[PDB]
Amino acid sequence: XXXXXXXXXXXPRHRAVNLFLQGYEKSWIETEEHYFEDKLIEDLAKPGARVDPLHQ
Amino acid sequence: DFVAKLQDNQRFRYNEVMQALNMSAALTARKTREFRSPPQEQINMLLNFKDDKSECPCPEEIRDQLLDFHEDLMTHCGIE
């Protein structure tokens, strides 16, 4: 039977720097590296001396 | 200058790994990077170190200088 089964089984320079610049801009600069969205309004709503700058 | 010091190092590592062939199964997977993977994704995947580690090649030496340049750029900009 095993024999039968066996029988059946047998049967260049500036391109690099340009691409480096593109990659650096794509995956290194816009990666969530600044927090100002609270201080800006905090110092914008102050009427230091009328209508506030943010109200304007 | 960064590209000047990175391209030559990549070519040097390619030459070294071709000199030390050591025929195995995974070397073709590690060498598809040169023939396949056009320069677009090539640079995209060889420039990645923001987390603890990535598949960065042996030039860990240029990562420090690029990080220094980025820190200089951000102190030049308005980011503290």
Side-chain angles (χ1 to χ4, degrees):
Chain A
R13 192 47 193 91
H14 39 74
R15 305 273 205 273
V17 56
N18 193 0
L19 293 167
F20 182 76
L21 277 183
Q22 302 311 84
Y24 187 81
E25 176 272 323
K26 183 60 193 61
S27 85
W28 198 274
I29 290 171
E30 64 275 58
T31 60
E32 191 273 329
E33 307 167 334
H34 199 224
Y35 267 34
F36 69 100
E37 293 88 349
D38 209 343
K39 183 69 72 69
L40 166 49
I41 294 89
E42 186 71 348
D43 57 53
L44 191 66
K46 300 183 175 307
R50 200 85 60 59
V51 169
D52 299 328
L54 188 153
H55 198 171
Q56 295 169 13
Chain B
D1 308 89
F2 196 92
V3 165
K5 203 167 67 160
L6 160 65
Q7 208 173 17
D8 77 323
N9 189 178
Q10 178 256 323
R11 265 74 178 269
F12 155 78
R13 90 166 178 264
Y14 181 77
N15 279 291
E16 170 186 358
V17 74
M18 284 314 79
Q19 184 177 2
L21 181 67
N22 199 301
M23 169 38 70
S24 307
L27 152 75
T28 178
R30 277 180 275 97
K31 288 315 154 293
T32 194
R33 174 264 310 150
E34 187 272 346
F35 291 107
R36 269 66 190 177
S37 83
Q40 275 324 3
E41 64 259 65
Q42 180 169 354
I43 192 69
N44 275 120
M45 67 188 176
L46 67 87
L47 185 144
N48 58 5
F49 48 103
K50 279 302 201 62
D51 57 336
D52 58 353
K53 182 64 174 179
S54 208
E55 57 176 0
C56 179
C58 55
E60 206 272 337
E61 40 231 42
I62 60 185
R63 299 171 36 159
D64 206 25
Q65 86 159 335
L66 188 153
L67 206 72
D68 192 4
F69 175 75
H70 181 77
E71 196 81 359
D72 208 335
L73 188 67
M74 311 313 260
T75 153
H76 193 270
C77 291
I79 303 103
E80 185 72 34

